[PDB]
Design a protein around this ligand. Structure first.
Ligand SMILES: *[C@@H]1O[C@H](CO)[C@@H](O)[C@H](O)[C@H]1NC(C)=O
Ligand SMILES: *[C@@H]1O[C@H](CO)[C@@H](O)[C@H](O)[C@H]1NC(C)=O
Ligand SMILES: *[C@@H]1O[C@H](CO)[C@@H](O)[C@H](O)[C@H]1NC(C)=O
Ligand SMILES: [Cl-]
Ligand SMILES: [Zn+2]
Length: 597
C-alpha cells in the first residue's frame, strides 16, 4: 500500500474514534459547566484525560507517514496537525519543570494580592478589586498605588519564572524545527504548497508592521484628544506633549481605553442609544432574544438553529442550587450537536452577545461536514471576527428600529454618531498599538534580541515610542511588567487580537458592499441580504480546509490582511478628531515622565 492511501486509512480511523471521544469529553464538560458538582468535575476531568491520551497516541502514531511522501494537501493538513510533538519533544524532567512553571505563574496571577499600606489586613485580588479600581477610580494616587503594587508584588514573583519559561519554550520550539517560541506561534498563519496563497511566518511580522503604520495617524489623533481630556480630569499631572501615564487608562494595563468614556465623551448631553429598557416594557425574555438572533441569520440565507440547540441549550441561569459558569460560550460538541451556554439577562448587551455567540454556532454548523481536524476557523483570528461582525449589524439604530426595540422617534445626530465612533475607537483603536507592541516585545524576547538585563528597559522604551504611554514609576529588571497581564503569564499568543480586528472590518466592508449599503460603513446592517450571507457562507463552510488567505479572498476579494476598511469605519471620527486637534500637539515626546521632576 502507498504511504498516502494508508495515511488516508489512518485518518479515517482517527476521525471516527476522535469524533466519539471528543463527544464524550464535551458532554462531560457541559455537565460540569451547567451543573457544577463534585462528581461532574470528576466525570469531566477523566473524560478529558482520555481524550488527551488518545490525541497523544494518535500523534506519535502519525509520525510514521512521511510528510514529504504526501501529495493530497487535504490529508497533509490533517496529518500536519496530528504529528505536532510540542512539549513532548522535551525530556521528562524538562516537561515536568515547564508544567510546574506554567502552573505556578498561573496561580500567582489568579491568587496574588496587594494590601493597603494603611491597613495590612485589607488586601485585594486583581479580580475584582484592583480591576474595580483601575476601571472606576478618578484618584491619581489610588490608581498609582494599585498599578505599581500589582507589578511590584506579583509581577516580580513572575520575573524569575518567566525567564526560565522562555528558555524552556524556545527549546521546545527549536527541537520542533522552529527558530524560537514566537516563530512557533506565527506558525498559525503559515500556508505552503499552494501556488498563489502561500504565506511565510516572518511575513506576518511585516504585514502587521506595514498595516500598523497606516493606523498611526488615526491613533495619534485619538491619543491627542484623550490626552487633552485626561488633563482636565487630572489637572497638572500630564504634559501637553507627553505620553499618557500608564495608570490612568481605564484598566490595569491600558489594554482597552473603554473605561475612559465618561472622561472623554464628545457630547455628554446626547443620550447613548440603549434599548435595555424597551426590551423590558415589551416583556422580552431569553427565548425571544435568541429567537430574534436566529431570525437575523435566516434573513441573510443561513439556516435556523437546530432542534436540540433549543432543547439542550442553557439560555438562562438556573439560579440557586444549580451553580454554573455564566461566561457566555458557544459549543460544538460534535456529531451535529450545537449549544449555547449563557445566563441571559434582558439587556441590550446580552441581546448583542447572543448574536455574537450565535455567530460562532453558525460558523460551526457551516463547516460541520469537514473532517474533524479541519473543523475550525481559517486561522486563529477568524471565529471572533465572525462573531464581532454580528453585533455590529445588530446594534445599528436602523436594526433596532426594524425590530421594534427603538422607535422611529429617536433622531440620529452627527453628534450621536461621533459619540458612538469615539466609544468604539476607545476599545477598538486604542488596543491595536497596545496589542502590537506587546507581541513585538515577546517576539524579540524569544528571538534573543533583548538581553534579560534590558527586558523592562526595552519594554518601557517600546511603550513610550509605539503606544505613547509611560510608566509612573521607574522599573528595573527586578520587575516583569508584561507578565502581569493574563495572556503573558498564562502562555497565550496575543497577535490574534490584532488580526481579528483588521479581519472583522474587511468582512464587514465586504458584506455591506454585497448588501448595497449606502452611507457610512458604521451604519450598516446586513439583514435581508442573502447576497451577504452567501459570500459569508462561502468561507464559513471551508473551516480550515483551505489556506486562510483563500478563505479571506472568498469573502473580501483579496488574499491579505488590509487596514483600509478599519480606517473607513472610523473616517467620520477621524475628520472630527483632526479638527478637534487643530490647536493641540499631535504625537508625543518619549522624554517626559511623571517623575522627571
Ligand atoms: C484528497 O482525498 C480526498 C478523500 O481521501 C478526496 O476526496 C479529495 O478529492 C483529495 N484531494 C484532491 C483533490 O487531491
Ligand atoms: C516527534 O518526535 C519523534 C521522536 O522524538 C520524531 O520521530 C518525529 O519526527 C517528531 N515529529 C516531527 C515530524 O516533528
Ligand atoms: C428583513 O426582511 C423582512 C421581511 O420582509 C423585513 O420585514 C425586515 O424589515 C428586513 N430587515 C431589514 C430591517 O432590512
Ligand atoms: Cl505594563
Ligand atoms: Zn466570541
Amino acid at each position: 500500500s502507498t504511504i498516502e492511501e494508508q495515511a488516508k486509512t489512518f485518518l479515517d480511523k482517527f476521525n471516527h474514534e476522535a469524533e466519539d471521544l471528543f463527544y464524550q469529553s464535551s458532554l462531560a464538560s457541559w455537565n460540569y459547566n451547567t451543573n457544577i458538582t463534585e462528581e461532574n468535575v470528576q466525570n469531566m476531568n477523566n473524560a478529558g484525560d482520555k481524550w488527551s491520551a488518545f490525541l497523544k497516541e494518535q500523534s506519535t502514531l502519525a509520525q510514521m507517514y512521511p510528510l514529504q511522501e504526501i501529495q493530497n494537501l487535504t490529508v497533509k493538513l490533517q496529518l500536519q496537525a496530528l504529528q505536532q510533538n510540542g512539549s513532548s519533544v522535551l525530556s521528562e524532567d524538562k516537561s515536568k519543570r515547564l508544567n510546574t512553571i506554567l502552573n505556578t505563574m498561573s496561580t500567582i496571577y489568579s491568587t496574588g494580592k496587594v494590601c493597603n499600606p494603611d491597613n495590612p489586613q485589607e488586601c485585594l485580588l486583581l479580580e475584582p478589586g484592583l480591576n474595580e479600581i483601575m476601571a472606576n477610580s478618578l484618584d491619581y494616587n489610588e490608581r498609582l498605588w494599585a498599578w505599581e503594587s500589582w507589578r511590584s508584588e506579583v509581577g516580580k514573583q513572575l520575573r524569575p519564572l518567566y525567564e526560565e519559561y522562555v528558555v524552556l519554550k524556545n527549546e521546545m520550539a527549536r527541537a520542533n524545527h522552529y527558530e524560537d517560541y514566537g516563530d512557533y506561534w506565527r506558525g498559525d498563519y503559515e500556508v505552503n504548497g499552494v501556488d498563489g496563497y502561500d504565506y511565510s511566518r516572518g511575513q506576518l511580522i511585516e504585514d502587521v508592521e506595514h498595516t500598523f503604520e497606516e493606523i498611526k495617524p488615526l491613533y495619534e489623533h485619538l491619543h491627542a484628544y484623550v490626552r487633552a481630556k485626561l488633563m482636565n480630569a487630572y489637572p497638572s499631572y500630564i504634559s501637553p506633549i507627553g505620553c499618557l501615564p500608564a495608570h490612568l487608562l481605564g484598566d490595569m494595563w491600558g489594554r482597552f481605553w473603554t473605561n475612559l468614556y465618561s472622561l472623554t465623551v464628545p457630547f455628554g448631553q446626547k443620550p447613548n442609544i440603549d434599548v435595555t429598557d424597551a426590551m423590558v416594557d415589551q416583556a422580552w425574555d431569553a427565548q425571544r432574544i435568541f429567537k430574534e438572533a436566529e431570525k437575523f441569520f435566516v434573513s441573510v440565507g443561513l439556516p435556523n438553529m437546530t432542534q436540540g440547540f433549543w432543547e439542550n441549550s442553557m439560555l438562562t441561569d438556573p439560579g440557586n442550587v444549580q451553580k454554573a459558569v455564566c461566561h457566555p460560550t458557544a459549543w460544538d460538541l460534535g456529531k451535529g450537536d450545537f449549544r449555547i451556554l449563557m445566563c441571559t439577562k434582558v439587556t441590550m448587551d446580552d441581546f448583542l452577545t447572543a448574536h455574537h455567540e450565535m455567530g460562532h454556532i453558525q460558523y460551526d454548523m457551516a463547516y460541520a461536514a469537514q473532517p474533524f481536524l479541519l473543523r475550525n476557523g481559517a486561522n486563529e483570528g477568524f471565529h471572533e471576527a465572525v462573531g464581532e461582525i454580528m453585533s455590529l449589524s445588530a446594534a445599528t439604530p436602523k436594526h433596532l428600529k426594524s425590530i421594534g426595540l427603538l422607535s422611529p422617534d429617536f433622531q440620529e445626530d452627527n453628534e450621536t454618531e461621533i459619540n458612538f465612533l469615539l466609544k468604539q475607537a476607545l476599545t477598538i483603536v486604542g488596543t491595536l498599538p497596545f496589542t502590537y507592541m506587546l507581541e513585538k516585545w515577546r517576539w524579540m524576547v524569544f528571538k534573543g534580541e533583548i538581553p534579560k538585563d534590558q527586558w523592562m528597559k526595552k519594554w518601557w522604551e517600546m511603550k513610550r515610542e509605539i503606544v505613547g504611554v509611560v510608566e509612573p514609576v521607574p522599573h528595573d529588571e527586578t520587575y516583569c511588567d508584561p507578565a502581569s497581564l493574563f495572556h503573558v503569564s498564562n502562555d497565550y499568543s496575543f497577535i490574534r487580537y490584532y488580526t481579528r480586528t483588521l479581519y472583522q472590518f474587511q468582512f464587514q466592508e465586504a458584506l455591506c458592499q454585497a448588501a448595497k449599503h449606502e452611507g457610512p460603513l458604521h451604519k450598516c446592517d446586513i439583514s435581508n441580504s442573502t447576497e451577504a450571507g452567501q459570500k459569508l457562507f462561502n468561507m464559513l463552510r471551508l473551516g480550515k480546509s483551505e489556506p486562510w488567505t483563500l478563505a479571506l479572498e472568498n469573502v473580501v476579494g483579496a488574499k491579505n490582511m488590509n487596514v483600509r476598511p478599519l480606517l473607513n469605519y472610523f473616517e467620520p471620527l477621524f475628520t472630527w478628531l483632526k479638527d478637534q486637534n487643530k490647536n493641540s500637539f499631535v504625537g508625543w515626546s518619549t522624554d517626559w515622565s511623571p517623575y522627571a521632576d
